Amino acid sequence: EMEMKNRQVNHARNIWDRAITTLPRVNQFWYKYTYMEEMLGNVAGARQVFERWMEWQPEEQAWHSYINFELRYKEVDRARTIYERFVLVHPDVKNWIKYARFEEKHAYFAHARKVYERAVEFFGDEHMDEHLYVAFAKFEENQKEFERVRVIYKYALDRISKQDAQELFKNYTIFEKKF
């Protein structure tokens, strides 16, 4: 902070690179380097520092910040290429439902079909963590009725002992009936 407060930018970057190489487990120095790069230009050194921070096995809060910084820089191919190794590290239910983020920008039909096939071919063939089916039903209700009645009724092989939830059976029935 004392080096960034002054007009020296070469020594500040050399101190930040040494702090990032000596303390790889620290996250405050990486956040300060990301803030200094956002205060600076949009050169490829910021993307290289982000790739070096992501290659050091970061958490989901750093991956979400990198995805937000990529989405706030008008990047479509670079955001989709950097999202392939994010789902392969943390296979969470919040990360599997956020992997199909290209449908919310240009509606990405082939990419949504590939993401649905990857979500059906992933882990959870018997329970699906009670979160992929509701998102698939919402994506089918927002789109046309191609496979909206199939995955809600004929795909009950991955259900857990009651074929629905307690407060989400009549709601799913009303969502499938009136759409």
Binding site: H106, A107, K144, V149
Partner: protein, 244 residues
């Protein structure tokens, strides 16, 4: 001004509009009219380029696209022989099958029943004159709606009865009429087709016919005015059983 002919020039100015802004259906209807001016321009000359240029606007999410393609299908019906009209209408009618609507806009849903069922109906199974309707073309229209459609129910079930005339088309018409619209809107036509199909397919004085007719209409609202009886009551009294 000089609409049929003046210099054989200003018709291009009639097709010249531009001024890009927010509009729905105006450039497509005026583009189809410009395709009629192209029909007076020598017909297929410049017409296919206008249909291909106006065929892609953003990604789906418009009812004017399939309306302009269907209008080109009507101009293809004005084209006499149905060979090329059926090939171009078959490919252009098969394009919405992959992707229909609901990309971005003010429409919450896709609503491909109207436009998609209109293009599929113009391609095959018109139930009036044009032929070349395959046995799977009715399932291609029911799959074209992909959920439920009411625009051509009576006529759709009549076409499935023309191509088949069996109990499978009657049960599919009853399910498509029940899931079509709640209450005896299309379900009343499903009841009429259930009695007529019950007599002409399931056999006269059949127990399953009364079981299904009494099962679908069981609770019911009061129909148009009311009928809870005369169909099933008269059918049961005419079945030869004075007890039931």
């Amino acid at each position: 001004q000089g609409r049929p002919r003046e210099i054989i020039n200003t018709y291009t100015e009639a097709v010249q509009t531009v001024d890009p802004f927010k509009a729905t259906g105006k450039p497509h209807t005026l583009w189809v009219a410009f395709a009629k001016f192209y029909e007076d321009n020598g017909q297929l000359d410049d017409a296919r380029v206008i249909l291909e240029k106006a065929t892609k606007v953003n990604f789906k999410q418009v009812d004017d696209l399939a309306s302009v393609w269907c209008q080109c299908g009507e101009l293809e019906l004005r084209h006499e022989n149905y060979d090329e009209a059926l090939r171009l209408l078959r490919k252009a009618t098969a394009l919405p099958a992959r992707r229909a609507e609901y990309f971005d806009g003010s429409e919450p849903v896709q609503n491909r029943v109207y436009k998609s069922l209109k293009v599929w109906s113009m391609l095959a199974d018109l139930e009036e004159s044009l032929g070349t309707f395959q046995s799977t073309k009715a399932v291609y229209d029911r799959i074209l709606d992909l959920r439920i459609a009411t625009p051509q129910i009576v006529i759709n079930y009549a076409m499935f009865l023309e191509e088949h005339k069996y109990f499978e088309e009657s049960f599919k018409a009853y399910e498509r009429g029940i899931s079509l619209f709640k209450w005896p809107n299309v379900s009343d036509i499903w009841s009429t087709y259930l009695t007529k199909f019950i007599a002409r397919y399931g056999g006269r004085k059949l127990e399953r016919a009364r079981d299904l007719f009494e099962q679908a209409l069981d609770g019911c609202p009061p129909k148009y005015a009311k009928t809870l009886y005369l169909l099933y009551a008269q059918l049961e009294e005419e079945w030869g059983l004075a007890r039931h």
